[PDB]
Amino acid sequence: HHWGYGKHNGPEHWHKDFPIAKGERQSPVDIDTHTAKYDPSLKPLSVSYDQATSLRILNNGHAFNVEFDDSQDKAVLKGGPLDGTYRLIQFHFHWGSLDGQGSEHTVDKKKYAAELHLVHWNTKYGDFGKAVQQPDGLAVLGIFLKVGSAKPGLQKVVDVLDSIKTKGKSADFTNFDPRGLLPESLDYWTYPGSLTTPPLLECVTWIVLKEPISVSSEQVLKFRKLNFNGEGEPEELMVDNWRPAQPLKNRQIKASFK
């Protein structure tokens, strides 16, 4: 009976195994655009994915991860609210069963069809495992997805999902360029938070872009064909793998734009 997104193991149950679920800096949160304040101390955000090296794609039973080789400083995120260099290690999405839900963060309570999470770890901590044990160990770039025009750069991902339909399945996924998943603008909101799934560690500096990318209905439909279950088990469609907004508590969401 391990955690999941169902009625008996979903988000409202996570606190029993992971008490931090009711912590002081949990994610995701609702972003109140009118309360978020422009922060002049924020430095220009730097997203350098030109030398990114993807290696494989995995269905871990909660979502699917496109993993990158982070043994060297290649695809990095810096600037903005960040101090130091954060290395890209993987990206994944959270989506819904319907176009009107799926995102973890919400903007003025509005839910998007999905949300992309590009995960990076602070290099001063040596490795990803050590980084997650630090308040400023990770930096996750969140990008909303809305249904409309197809996103050309996402099709490569969409077409390989049939090969990793069930939990535990992985497939080679080299030479995928994450720059093809970024919107035009880098305007963003930032706040201190946590991982959005167990163990819910409060080690993340969240940077959520204001501009969403558009993906086609067909593209998101394929996301919904994935399975939460492993091969040979009753089919449980991988949909609604998002955690709802959590209490903001003693935090302020800062905006990079005036």
Ligand X SMILES: COc1cc2c(cc1OS(N)(=O)=O)CC[C@@H]1[C@@H]2CC[C@]2(C)[C@@H](CC#N)CC[C@@H]12
Known binding-site residue numbers? 92, 94, 117, 196-197
In the complex with Zn ion, which residue's Cβ is closer, 34 or 70?
Answer: 70
**First-to-last C-alpha distance (Å) of the chain:** 47
For 59, how many CA atoms within 13 A lie in the half-sphere containing its CB? 25
Q: Which residue among 153, 199, 230, 244 contacts ligand X (CB under 6 A)?
A: 199
Q: Which is nearer to Zn ion, 25 or 117 (CB)?
A: 117
Annotation marks residue 62 as catalytic: yes
Contact status, residue 131 vs residue 138, Cβ threshold 8 Å: yes
- 237 secondary structure, DSSP code: B
Q: How many CA atoms lie within 13 A of 133 on its CB side?
A: 6
Q: CB count, 10 Å around CB of 37?
A: 11
Residue 222 DSSP label: H
The reply on whether position 87 binds Zn ion by CB under 5 A is no
- Considering beta carbons, is residue 31 or 201 the nearer one to ligand X? 201
Contact 167, 229 (CB under 8 A): yes
What is the rounded distance in angstroms from the CA atom of residue 41 to the CA atom of residue 81?
Answer: 8
Per-residue contact string for residues 146-185; x = within reach of ligand X by CB under 6 A: ----------------------------------------
Minimum CB separation of residue 91 from ligand X in Å reads: 9
Binding-site entries for Zn(2+):
92, 94, 117
Catalytic residue among 2, 13, 15, 62: 62
Least distance from C-beta 17 to Zn ion, angstroms?
19
- Listed residue (251, 253, 242, 250) closest to 100, CA to CA: 242
74-82, 128-136, 146-154, 210-218 -> range binding ligand X (CB under 6 A): 128-136
Please, which residue, 100 or 129, has the CB nearer to ligand X? 129
CA distance 89 to 99: 28
Helix (H, G, I), strand (E, B) or coil at 144: strand
Shortest approach of ligand X to residue 34 CB, angstroms?
Answer: 26
Considering only residues 25, 117, 120, 210, which one is a binding residue for Zn ion as defined by CB under 5 A? Answer: 117
| Binding stretches for ligand X (CB under 6 A) | 117, 119, 128-129, 132, 138, 140, 195-197, 199, 201
